[PDB]
Design a protein around this ligand. Sequence first.
Ligand code: ZN
Lengths: 102, 369
Amino acid sequence: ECLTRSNLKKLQEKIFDRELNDIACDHCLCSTENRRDIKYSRLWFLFELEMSENWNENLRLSCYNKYVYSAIDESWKMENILLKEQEKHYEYFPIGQLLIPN
Amino acid sequence: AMDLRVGRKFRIGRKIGSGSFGDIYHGTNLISGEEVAIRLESIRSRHPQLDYESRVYRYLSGGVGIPFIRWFGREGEYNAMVIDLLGPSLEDLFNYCHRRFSFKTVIMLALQMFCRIQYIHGRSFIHRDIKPDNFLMGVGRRGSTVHVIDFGLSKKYRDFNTHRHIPYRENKSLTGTARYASVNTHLGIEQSRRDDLESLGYVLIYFCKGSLPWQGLKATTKKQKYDRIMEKKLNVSVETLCSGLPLEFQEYMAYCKNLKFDEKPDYLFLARLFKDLSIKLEYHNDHLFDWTMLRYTKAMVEKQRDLLIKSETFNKIKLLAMKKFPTHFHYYKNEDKHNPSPEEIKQQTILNNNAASSLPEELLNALDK
Ligand SMILES: [Zn+2]
């Protein structure tokens, strides 16, 4: 329960083992072949996974949360951030940029 | 044991970064499922800064593009600060785009970065650590918005009661990143508002050209390195520094370097420079950055590639994006030593249109979309 260097390390090992081995979709952006191309994990996790294959959820929710977090704990909740408003003090965000064609 | 929490309300997930203060984790609010970022700092650190940062963030709260603090406090052997989950930094996206940004993207970024710095200054703070790494895009529908982070070196430049500007002082140590540090910072002069803007200027030039002239200088020690970067900065004219760029960049740098120590910047003049440049280049306000179009083109191409079945692979995607969005992608040319006109820059539109593409079959599929 308590946050220690060791508990953190063990959590990360489980998360990354799932991430590396168990994301079992067939999406190009989710794939290990796509990831192998990028050096800065944030460009994958916080940028390319913003895209949406089904046009309802992004891939961080539809795939990462399913095969990693949910696999660790089924009760681990993640909201759909694309259902949020276009918020008043934010630049307009054209949603089409996330909607993967075909 | 796999359920690690901070502030009793947030659950720690995937590590997403690692700074000199400590590490950064993706997290989620346990009740709402809202995504957050959790920064952890060991209390064993010799230069603790998270407590200070959390107070500066809270003080600045409500400004556009200022991350909202959800929580700060001790958890075990760490201090933890929970904020809005943000996307990649501009340095990250710079790498994504293979370390050149178009003029349209540089202008889009400049305008937002101006507003952030203007806001911070209006709250009596200077940032003092301006660099691409400390500006991050949001996620979700906040993804068009530049945010500013890392207030560890920030300080107030004026007294609350009197609004008296901090006194001019010397012998001050260079505390930020050397690559973007203002000249006066190298000279050990107290930083003020002018220095945030000068550093921002260096960042914008860096985005355009891929590098700054004082990168790659070699030295035996750290102080030697800082001094050599200093001497390079002292001896490169604004003309030389901004060669090959629209004159607006040179005008920006000359203005910022000319500011007196306690002088209030004319932020509107600086913004107008780039807004006007954008109008002259006929860039539409469509919120499409380079990476917006590169990511979209890549996803679309790779999916078609999969149905059909590096730097070279990236370059092919970039070529396709530039053909699809020919008026968006105009770049600095290393050969240019003059300052190009808007019509001259817009020649690249025609180039982008007629750029030959390598893969016949895949293109036929992209066309048939
Ligand atoms: Zn997937």
